[PDB]
Design an enzyme around this catalytic site. Structure first.
Site, PDB file in Angstrom:
ATOM      1  N   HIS D  11      25.625   4.024 -24.577  1.00  0.00           N
ATOM      2  CA  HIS D  11      24.783   5.197 -24.845  1.00  0.00           C
ATOM      3  C   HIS D  11      23.609   5.427 -23.879  1.00  0.00           C
ATOM      4  O   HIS D  11      23.509   6.519 -23.330  1.00  0.00           O
ATOM      5  CB  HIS D  11      24.321   5.240 -26.311  1.00  0.00           C
ATOM      6  N   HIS D 102      32.441 -13.387  -1.791  1.00  0.00           N
ATOM      7  CA  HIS D 102      32.727 -14.726  -2.309  1.00  0.00           C
ATOM      8  C   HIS D 102      33.635 -14.717  -3.538  1.00  0.00           C
ATOM      9  O   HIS D 102      34.450 -15.619  -3.709  1.00  0.00           O
ATOM     10  CB  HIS D 102      31.416 -15.473  -2.626  1.00  0.00           C
ATOM     11  N   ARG D 137      37.924 -21.487   0.972  1.00  0.00           N
ATOM     12  CA  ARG D 137      37.168 -22.004  -0.171  1.00  0.00           C
ATOM     13  C   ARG D 137      37.034 -21.005  -1.327  1.00  0.00           C
ATOM     14  O   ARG D 137      37.132 -21.401  -2.485  1.00  0.00           O
ATOM     15  CB  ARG D 137      35.811 -22.579   0.262  1.00  0.00           C
TER      16      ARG D 137
END
Lengths: 153, 152, 152, 153
Positions: D11, D102, D137
């Site tokens: 809202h 990332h 990674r």
């Protein structure tokens, strides 16, 4: 016994000037908002209202200033050009508190375009309610700010 | 060559070498001139603010960087020097807009408030972003100079 | 005794002792349980998020603290555990509102985004601020549980 | 070839839903806003719209989600309960960029009450424009997030 708080804005922050008046009151019944910003939504130049509120603070007509603009950056530059003024651009609770604790700031600056109204609310309340620490190092440093002012007067 | 004077107080001394590197990362033309403390012992921020701010005011460097706990004291003190427009920035947007709108010549950061990667972003953005040169901004910046003049 | 499990990845390892202290600063009842890496060498945040989040889910600790680079990965991973409400906070307001509105049980911070004094403020505020218990908030939190149930 | 971006709000953030639609377009012509938030200013529960947008992302009906609420915190909790979703609560340019670089985040969350519209603008644009790095990674870590999902399915 009560404490006057002058409020200024530029055009984009005009939409929230009633908010600002309210947030000052929310800090406590002892805080009296003095609205000195534009009376309408018309385009204005921030330095004119920064100056207006800053001078009131410097002349001690009010104890505190609130300046709200797009970013608050120009507000904080303009207001600090007035001797006696320590205008802190704040973006959260921590800077608002520390501006008072370490810098005995007398004007809080905020950005309407950068900071949500509920954080602005928190900033204004924290700024008004947080006392200056009075600690030796802060007094010395504030005095060095005053010394910088004098050397350019 | 666009020279950038760097000043810190004690808490930000630990990251002074970061600030030196961040200035260089903004581009080869950017030259850090470190003017901060040379040890970690406590100093007073207005001393280092003044030093950097006077260099900017006098046109000896184009830009300054002040890093302290919050940067609030840095921005108050630096702005007391005529010709300085010192912007306390806490993100990319404020850093950019300080240059675009205000043509800020000093950037202030809090080492205790803002993580170093965001300080890195602030410094790079500040140095890289040009002033808009737009009419209203020029008028407002002159109005800042007219406030200085009215108190000098 | 209100136990608080602490997890970090590699960049936030440097401040793990800070986090332990900040938890204690919230009050004598708050007990840090450090579950992060024991050396500075690189780890994967979801491993430490999961570890802390499972402890919270299983009711072995009341609260978790996850600190990483941005905290974004921490908050994504921790929330994948049913019963976890992990809030990535960047100031006092978000920390407070995460407890007031969301009854968050894990607080996430970025060591690279948020200065340690604000991380300190976030952790203290998070732990001290109670859930409102208000009707709409309870309804919405249950709706979160109903999303979990619909995927379990 | 274009990229769909589902938008949801509760809202208080309804007042800025046109802003959000516009900010998505501002990221580039290749980004198509799909507004899925409340049609009116009526009080709603954030998890319902978080779920709505999150499911669209998970089912791959859209590539990205935008969730704006008071704080964005509840939005980010609710949306992440949907498997396949990586919902990032962002408050500035840096978190917006890094959530993509990332975390390969697929939903951006923001708070209307905390973050000014111009920063929200910057967040949405940066989020949509910043690529995932693909680095070893991050892939491994995202896969570990997926593994956590599986172990609770």
């Amino acid at each position: 016994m009560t404490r006057r708080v002058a409020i200024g804005t530029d055009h984009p922050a005009f939409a929230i000037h009633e908010n600002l008046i309210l947030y000052v009151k929310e800090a406590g019944d002892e805080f009296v908002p003095v609205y000195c910003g534009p009376k309408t939504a018309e385009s204005v130049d921030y330095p004119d209202f920064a100056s207006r509120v800053a001078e009131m603070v410097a002349r001690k007509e009010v104890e505190f200033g609130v300046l709200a603009a797009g970013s608050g950056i120009g507000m904080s530059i303009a207001a600090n050009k007035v001797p006696g003024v320590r205008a802190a651009l704040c973006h959260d609770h921590y800077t608002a508190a520390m501006s008072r604790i370490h810098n005995d700031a007398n004007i809080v600056c905020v950005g309407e375009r950068t900071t949500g109204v509920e954080v602005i609310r928190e900033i204004i309340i924290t700024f008004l309610q947080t006392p200056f620490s009075g600690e030796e190092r802060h007094v010395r440093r504030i005095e060095k700010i005053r010394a910088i002012e004098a050397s350019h007067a």
